[PDB]
Write an enzyme that holds these catalytic residues in place. Sequence first.
Site, PDB file in Angstrom:
ATOM      1  CG  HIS B 347      -2.019  -0.955   1.137  1.00  0.00           C
ATOM      2  ND1 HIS B 347      -3.256  -0.620   0.640  1.00  0.00           N
ATOM      3  CD2 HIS B 347      -2.099  -2.251   1.508  1.00  0.00           C
ATOM      4  CE1 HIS B 347      -4.054  -1.670   0.701  1.00  0.00           C
ATOM      5  NE2 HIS B 347      -3.378  -2.675   1.224  1.00  0.00           N
ATOM      6  CE  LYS B 538      -5.979  14.169   0.577  1.00  0.00           C
ATOM      7  NZ  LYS B 538      -6.541  12.896   0.108  1.00  0.00           N
ATOM      8  NE  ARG B 539      -5.181   9.537  10.535  1.00  0.00           N
ATOM      9  CZ  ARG B 539      -4.959   8.486  11.336  1.00  0.00           C
ATOM     10  NH1 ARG B 539      -5.700   7.390  11.258  1.00  0.00           N
ATOM     11  NH2 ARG B 539      -3.983   8.527  12.230  1.00  0.00           N
ATOM     12  CE  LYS B 544      -3.323  11.061   2.693  1.00  0.00           C
ATOM     13  NZ  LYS B 544      -4.176  10.430   1.658  1.00  0.00           N
ATOM     14  CB  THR B 646      -9.906   5.203  -1.781  1.00  0.00           C
ATOM     15  OG1 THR B 646      -9.621   5.427  -0.392  1.00  0.00           O
ATOM     16  CG2 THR B 646      -9.143   3.924  -2.179  1.00  0.00           C
ATOM     17  CE  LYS B 650     -13.797   6.649  -0.187  1.00  0.00           C
ATOM     18  NZ  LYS B 650     -13.521   6.396   1.239  1.00  0.00           N
TER      19      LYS B 650
END
EC number: 2.4.1.1
Lengths: 803, 805
Positions: B347, B538-539, B544, B646, B650
């Site tokens: 992942h 998101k985390r 990110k 993901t 969405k």
Amino acid sequence: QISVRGLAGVENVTELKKNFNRHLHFTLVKDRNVATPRDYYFALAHTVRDHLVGRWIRTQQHYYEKDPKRIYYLSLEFYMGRTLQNTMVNLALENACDEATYQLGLDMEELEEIEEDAGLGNGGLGRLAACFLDSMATLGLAAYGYGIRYEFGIFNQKICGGWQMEEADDWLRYGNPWEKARPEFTLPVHFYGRVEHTQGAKWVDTQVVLAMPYDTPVPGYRNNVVNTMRLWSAKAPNGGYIQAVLDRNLAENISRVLYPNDNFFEGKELRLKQEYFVVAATLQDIIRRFKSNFDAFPDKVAIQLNDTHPSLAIPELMRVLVDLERLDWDKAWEVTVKTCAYTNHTVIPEALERWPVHLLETLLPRHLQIIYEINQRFLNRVAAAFPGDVDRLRRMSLVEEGAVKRINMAHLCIAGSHAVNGVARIHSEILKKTIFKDFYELEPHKFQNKTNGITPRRWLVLCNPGLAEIIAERIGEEYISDLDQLRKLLSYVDDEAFIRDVAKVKQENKLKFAAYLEREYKVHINPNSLFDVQVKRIHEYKRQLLNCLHVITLYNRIKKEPNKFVVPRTVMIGGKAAPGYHMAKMIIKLITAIGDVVNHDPVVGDRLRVIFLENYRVSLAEKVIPAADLSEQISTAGTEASGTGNMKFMLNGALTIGTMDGANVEMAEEAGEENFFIFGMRVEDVDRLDQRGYNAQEYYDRIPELRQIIEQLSSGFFSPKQPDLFKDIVNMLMHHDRFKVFADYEEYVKCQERVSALYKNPREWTRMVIRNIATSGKFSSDRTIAQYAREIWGVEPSRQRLP
Amino acid sequence: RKQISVRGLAGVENVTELKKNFNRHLHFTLVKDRNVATPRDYYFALAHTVRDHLVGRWIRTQQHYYEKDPKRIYYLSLEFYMGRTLQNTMVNLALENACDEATYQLGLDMEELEEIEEDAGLGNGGLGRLAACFLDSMATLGLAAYGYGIRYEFGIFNQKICGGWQMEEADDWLRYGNPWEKARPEFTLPVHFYGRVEHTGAKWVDTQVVLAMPYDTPVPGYRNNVVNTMRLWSAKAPNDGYIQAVLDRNLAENISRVLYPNDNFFEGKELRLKQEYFVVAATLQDIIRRFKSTNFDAFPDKVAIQLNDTHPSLAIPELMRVLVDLERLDWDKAWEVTVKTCAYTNHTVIPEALERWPVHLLETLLPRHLQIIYEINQRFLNRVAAAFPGDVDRLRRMSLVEEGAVKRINMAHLCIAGSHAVNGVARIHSEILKKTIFKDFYELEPHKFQNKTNGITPRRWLVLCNPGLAEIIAERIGEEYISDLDQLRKLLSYVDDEAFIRDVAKVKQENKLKFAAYLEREYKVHINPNSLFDVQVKRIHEYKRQLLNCLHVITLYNRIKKEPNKFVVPRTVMIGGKAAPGYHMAKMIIKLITAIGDVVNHDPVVGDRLRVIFLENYRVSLAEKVIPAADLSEQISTAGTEASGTGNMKFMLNGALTIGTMDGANVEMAEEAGEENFFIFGMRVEDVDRLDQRGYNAQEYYDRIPELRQIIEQLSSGFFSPKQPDLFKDIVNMLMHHDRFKVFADYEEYVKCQERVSALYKNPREWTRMVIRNIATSGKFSSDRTIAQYAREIWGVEPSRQRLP
Ligand SMILES: NC(=O)CN1C(=O)[C@@H](NC(=O)C2=CC3=C[C@H](Cl)SC3=N2)Cc2ccccc21
Ligand SMILES: NC(=O)CN1C(=O)[C@@H](NC(=O)C2=CC3=C[C@H](Cl)SC3=N2)Cc2ccccc21
Ligand SMILES: *Cc1c(COP(=O)(O)O)cnc(C)c1O
Ligand SMILES: *Cc1c(COP(=O)(O)O)cnc(C)c1O
């Protein structure tokens, strides 16, 4: 399908079947292909439980409107046992469920053996609370049992190589259908912190543990009443992150496990926490239910303290009335005393809760301040009534001086309660005369007797349906909730059929217990022997040791005269030892070791078997007590407050061998001393013997048969691989025996010979048994409870059926 | 209303029976009546009413599998981020309208009831939500599939924002009792720990035992009468002073206590390792039990074990251990079975993500497994050696054993060696794995390496969370697209359709009012619904770059202040996500977001033109609310840091346009949509590692970009924390000198790209037509397509959407 288990009517049986099938599918997600026996138990449990619901709702609604005085039985213990059969009995559903299950291809008694005991007490005190709940619902009282939902109850006892092993009683493993979590009434309980004083005190900076209530239904006998047992479970409120989440465990440990401390005081902080935890959640709950002024509070609320374990309810109630509701001290005190009443269950000094002052200061600072204030005011009363009596003040104080200063919780109880009762007539007299003499002289009105009792539902109808039926055939079913009607059976002592029937029922019961042992332990006993049963917690005061001396006497007597006929006996002893009671665990090992010798000596064979019954608990009491011939109740006079196992054996067709101690004295008075096997020292004889000093050695030097036994004990006869294994038992008996086993040896052994002689005559054994069963009515817990109700709580019982 | 077509038929007969059973449950199950039933009791009564409709299908489905004996698929994960169950159960059984009408007639609003349910937050983020989407898809595609994991008592922590800072509260999701689980106590199994290895062959003795008690949750497929099982293991002390011993049961039971909140970060806790073995050991015993209902030659024909990352990697040594020591197979035979049974999903590529357990710890905890690993490693390396003789450095590199001060086992290498298949989670990811990260392994066993692009279920992520969108779509192309999402391609022929354009903009708007009513109701946060909803959920990770979003927000503020009369497209910029509780940097980043909001939201010159708001407690249930409300999806990780993503999918499915980098699955989304329909900025993978070769210097960017230099000075000087002026010194230092993620490198193009976003927002017809061009091509990112690929290309099973009786 005996008459006393009710009707199996066609429609009712069909709807039960449908519902069993509905729960197996929708609730348990099974079909017949893959259903486990446990699934079938749960399917029945839910089916039966559905029938409780409307009545539970209707009962609780009817109290809210009738607004009767409410009774709050506060106890650290509720030794409930199993619930399924009891619900069926009380709902008149037993026969109709037994037939539903038959038709579905199932044995309902097989399914009943799957149910875990709710073993949330130690013995007498905790079972008494359970019988009480039962009786209070039967007598229509607006009563609540309040306690702790221990995750682990009284430990399961396993016997390994003749010794007690303890295993966790993981009674909730599979889920409990008979509780209803009520997380909506969750309440905060406070610990540690400190007190500030200003228009009053404020307990601040506390640690919080949440109390989450679980409600269990408590159905009365066929009266459509369902009261509630509310048990509290601890929940954390809402290194680093992970350790913090795991440390939630520490607070939740408060409700983790029942202290297996039977009549012994340990002084553990976690114990103290348990006691306060039940007390604070419960009182908040009582107060929330009262507000729906406090002048009327004792008019709407009775709190009964089962022993001193919930004693902090006295200072907690004061703390709430004074610091939170802002009442004046004396008005709050007046309300508290009128609310609160205390039951004492033992005279044994080592039983007494004496909490260190340092420990209460840290955990419950505000309560310790209240206790001092209460003490101050109470001792001012003692001083005014008895001026210049300094030693009286010292003796009566809630504070005991010493190296470690303690609070005596019994004394706090007496101070804060409008009634103080003992639990059998002699025990209550002992309290007035000796233990609480000073308190009695100050406040003679306070002191009462309430002789214990047992419920004739679980303890007859449920456990011995056969005995129940042959009684009902002669006198109908009214007696089941009015047990004094058992006296009518006295008119049947010369009735040939009833005599035959009473003996046939005991025989069938004995056969039944034999098959149990054969099936679960591969242990065979002969059912054509006199079943000599001593079941109860293992303590020196109960004298399982005196019983042991008897068995070895019987064995040595056989060896001396092997060709002489003796009445064959199966001597069964059962019960758990506290995990930190060395001497009690040694007694268990002794019993099994005698067993190891007596059971394997070819000269004895079937003439005498000695067996230790593993894991004595309520459900096992239900099996062995109906099969007993002889009930062993041999505590040293003055040490057994009441006993209730004694009442159980009486109700179920055993004759009693016992001392004049606790309720034994009243049992013998009801049945007639002629119908009882009384032996040994009276309380006066023990006292005379303590005035001169007890010398066990005197008995050893003049009683040949006793000397032989003690030298077998010390020499290695009953432990050949470890010859000194019982040196501690021998030393205790010969030089340090608080309970004077040797003093009663001779009379006990002689009186046992009479029991045997009587057993050789089956017709007169049976007639004597009838005279015992017939006079057991006084030992109904309905009688006990009516007395509490009328003489302490100020309510009137009614057996009137609810709509 | 409300009662729309896609939510099914509210039939009279069904509605009357649902109301009956609701009232029955309220009475017999819950012991309540109307007088005193709580709004929560009403949730529970409905939950039981609906759950009942699963039972026949569940029993029938699992009985079907037992008779048909298909190959079984065991999806092994330490996480299943399932969210709530009540709506998803209703959707999948075509019961929503019927229950909404039933509860309606009962005087109850069903949406209010749904909002009572706790998330099952038994995962962190992408990895765990992926497993949940996969269980959904596997049941919709009729596979005989079980998800196997841990029932944590406490899932992902509940996040509270206090003083602008994250605080962590225990997620006590089982508090009121979980009706969507069924304890399976007969299937309890013992898991062993510690002990030692004896030899007679080998035998593992003197172990401490912890019981593993299974809880099964039903997993309903989309209107096919199939109900599969997620089996989750709970820790349970065995039943063999006294008081302390009872209390010390807590120690063993702690294994299932709490989900590790590490999101792509290996921490190396022994407790973590016990969780991983706990699930592995119980699961594998269960698999073998069911297989034998013994020739293990057919075992791979009847069992697939998919490893969600390396977390369940011990599955390899454990299967070997059971097959060799217990079932007395010879080693080579046992190996062939193992490899043929196992497959591994990687992942992420980030080195700190990677599990490397010290040898000392495995030795003590799992002594037999470490031997089996050293033996596995030996024969792997004898194969490596025979394939590339003389390549000693390649032996060092591929070894299961890492050398150093602290010797460790690389669990990814274990996974590759012991699996017949290894896949990445998006095309660009699976290629970076062959070409670099696992280059050596790819050279040895090129047959092994695959791609499986991530997906999301369009049940929970469309029909559930955006029914209005599902309905306007169904009106045009029918309802088949729900389980055949490539049919959204039909909407392309509607890109000029005036009523569709109108309708899409109408649904988006409606979802925006909705979400703004949520913030107003649950918090007291005012947001303007006629603003562009700019969403980054998101985390919280440096990679990110919530920080690059932050520099953009400040730019916008400072742009307004320079030209207060100049019109700007109004925006509500929303950032949400959880920080790992000991990641100081991610926590600081959360605090910076709130602090920027404290200035921007309070500056009277700005007002409703720009609001900056931090969405508390981002989790699956919040995603269902906010994603349908988003106009712009922020997907701005640094190139080659985000394996797939993901949430990106969405937002695409729900009608947001995407600003992001060419990273992970963003690449495939722009290719399905057309890159003209996609707001792409920044460095590509080439440009990152090109810049790593020359050395990245962040000071070079600062020296040349004045608006970036004013921002940094607001940060250091204390403009965004006047009380604690150096509060953000740490973030400035990291950006200036220690930025692994090249925030200044992409700033210029990102801001510019954001201007194109705003320019298009000012043209709503063309905004909307671009949206349509995105929804219409979102089909590829259905986890139905993902799972179809896993089944055919890895597992050897054919999916079928045929309805069970
Ligand atoms: N009580 C709760 O807050 C909610 N709740 C339940 O009540 C639980 N019913 C019971 O336990 C329960 C019903 C009963 C009738 C009795 Cl006469 S005794 C008894 N017990 C079903 C459930 C299932 C899953 C989650 C929650 C719940
Ligand atoms: N745990 C057991 O083995 C027995 N048991 C239950 O399983 C419990 N039913 C459920 O949990 C349950 C039924 C379900 C249908 C679903 Cl589609 S999901 C789901 N869960 C009722 C209960 C109540 C009180 C004690 C025990 C139990
Ligand atoms: C009734 C009972 C007791 C009390 O018995 P005593 O002989 O009075 O000590 C203890 N344990 C159990 C399981 C009982 O049923
Ligand atoms: C989908 C989702 C994720 C994954 O989001 P990314 O942006 O791909 O990291 C994380 N958390 C929740 C609650 C989600 O639903």
